[PDB]
Amino acid sequence: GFLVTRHSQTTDDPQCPPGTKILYHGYSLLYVQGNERAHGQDLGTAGSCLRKFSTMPFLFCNINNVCNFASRNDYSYWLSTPEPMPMSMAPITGENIRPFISRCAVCEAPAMVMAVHSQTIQIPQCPTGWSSLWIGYSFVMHTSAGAEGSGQALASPGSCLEEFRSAPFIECHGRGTCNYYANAYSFWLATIERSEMFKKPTPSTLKAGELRTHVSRCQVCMRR
C-alpha cells in the first residue's frame, strides 16, 4: 500500500528499487506557480510524477465560473536532464523540450521508506532494521522566478537526489517556452564538523570541482 517515487534525472525511465514493484512511469514535476504563488509536490511522493508533460499542466477558474488556460503568466518546473542548453541561451520550445525533462517511476513498496542525512561527505548508515534503496545528496529547497519556490521533507526520499546538479530543474511557461535562468537557486544541506556545530560558520564560495565537497550525503532506506 506504500508508494516509493524515484527520479532518473535523465530521459530514461528509472527502475523501481529492489523490493518494490512498478505502478507507472512519468515526468518529474518539481512545482508549479499559479497567480504568483508556488506550490510544490514532494519529490518522494507520486505527486511529483505526472503521466503527461506540458509547460502548463493546469488552469484556473474564477468566481464568475470562467476558466482560463495558458492565457496569463504562470509557470511549471520539472527536474531536468544533463541535456546541454542551446548555445544561443534562448528559450527552448515544443518537441525540443523533451530531451531536458527528467523521468520518474512510482512503485509499490511493502514497507515505509525514509531518508537519513549525515551532514558530512560520508554516507549515513540506514537505521537498524532498515535496508538501503539508494544513496545521494541532501536536497532541501529551491527558488526560481520571483524568488518563489518550494522544498523537500528531509525525512522523505525526495530530499535525497541521486545525482547532484547545481541547476537540477528547468523553468517552463504557459506560453510554451522553457529555459534555465540565472536567478534559479538550489539549496542543499551543508557538511558540518561536530566540533564546529556551535562555532561561527566559515563562509565559502565553491567552483566546479569543489562543489560537492560541502554537500551533505544521504541514504534512502526501507524498513524491511
Partner: protein, 222 residues
C-alpha cells in the same frame, strides 16, 4: 490509516463500510496569520476540524502576550453548493456554506491517481476505488496567499468540481464571503498521449469547462 472525506455540503459525509468514524467536523483549507497562509492537506485528518469558528486560533509574541481575535487574521474553508451571497454572511447564516468532513479508520492506505485526461484513471492492480473526482491542484485568494494539494493525497481528488470550492471567513468580524480574487487551479486534460507541445490558450465559459478538467480516482489497497 485515516481516510478523510469532505462532503462539500452542509451534511456529514458517510464513512465507507467497515471504517469506524473517529470524528466529523468542518473542512479546513487554511489559516492566514500575519497574511501568511498555513494550509491543511485535504487528505489528512488535520483538515477536518471538529469545532468551527471564523477565528479558530490565537497568537503570542515573545513578550509573553497572546492575542485572540484582536487583529486582522482569517480562516478559509471548503464550501458547499450554497449560492454565492450578495453580501457577507454572519454567524448562524454561515452554517449552510461550510463543507463537512469525516475522519475514518481504514485498513489500508488510500491514494489518488490522476489521468490528465477526460478518462477516469484506473486504480493500481490490487487496489479498489473509493470515489472518482476532479484534479484539484492549488488555490489563491487574498493577496497571493493560498496553498495546494498533494497529487497523491485524496485531498487532490474532489468529487464535486467547482470554480470556487472554498469560502473566506474574516476572523474577528465573524462573517464569511466570496471575493473576486478567489482562484481554484486544476490539472488539465491533455489530448497527446504523454508529451504536449505548445499549449493552446483558451478561455472556457461554464459549459466547455468539464472537458478541460483532469479526472482522478481515490484508491485503497485490496
Amino acid at each position: 490509516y485515516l481516510l478523510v472525506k469532505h462532503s462539500q455540503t452542509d451534511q456529514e459525509p458517510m464513512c465507507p463500510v467497515g471504517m469506524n468514524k473517529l470524528w466529523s467536523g468542518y473542512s479546513l483549507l487554511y489559516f492566514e496569520g500575519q497574511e501568511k497562509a498555513h494550509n491543511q492537506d485535504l487528505g489528512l485528518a488535520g483538515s477536518c476540524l471538529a469545532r468551527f469558528s471564523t477565528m479558530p486560533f490565537l497568537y503570542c509574541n515573545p513578550g509573553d502576550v497572546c492575542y485572540y481575535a484582536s487583529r486582522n487574521d482569517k480562516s478559509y474553508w471548503l464550501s458547499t453548493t450554497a449560492p454565492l451571497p450578495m453580501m457577507p454572511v454572519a454567524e448562524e447564516d454561515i452554517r449552510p456554506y461550510i463543507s463537512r468532513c469525516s475522519v475514518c479508520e481504514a485498513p489500508a492506505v488510500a491514494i489518488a491517481v490522476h489521468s490528465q485526461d477526460v478518462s477516469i484513471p484506473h486504480c493500481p492492480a490490487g487496489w479498489r476505488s473509493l470515489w472518482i473526482g476532479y484534479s484539484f491542484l492549488m488555490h489563491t485568494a487574498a493577496g497571493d496567499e493560498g496553498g495546494g494539494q498533494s497529487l497523491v493525497s485524496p485531498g487532490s481528488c474532489l468529487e464535486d468540481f467547482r470554480a470556487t470550492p472554498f469560502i473566506e471567513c474574516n476572523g474577528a468580524r465573524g462573517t464569511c464571503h466570496y471575493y473576486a480574487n478567489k482562484y481554484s487551479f486544476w490539472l488539465t486534460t491533455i489530448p497527446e498521449q504523454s508529451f504536449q507541445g505548445t499549449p493552446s490558450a483558451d478561455t472556457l465559459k461554464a459549459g466547455l469547462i468539464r472537458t478541460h478538467i483532469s479526472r482522478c480516482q481515490v484508491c485503497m489497497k485490496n
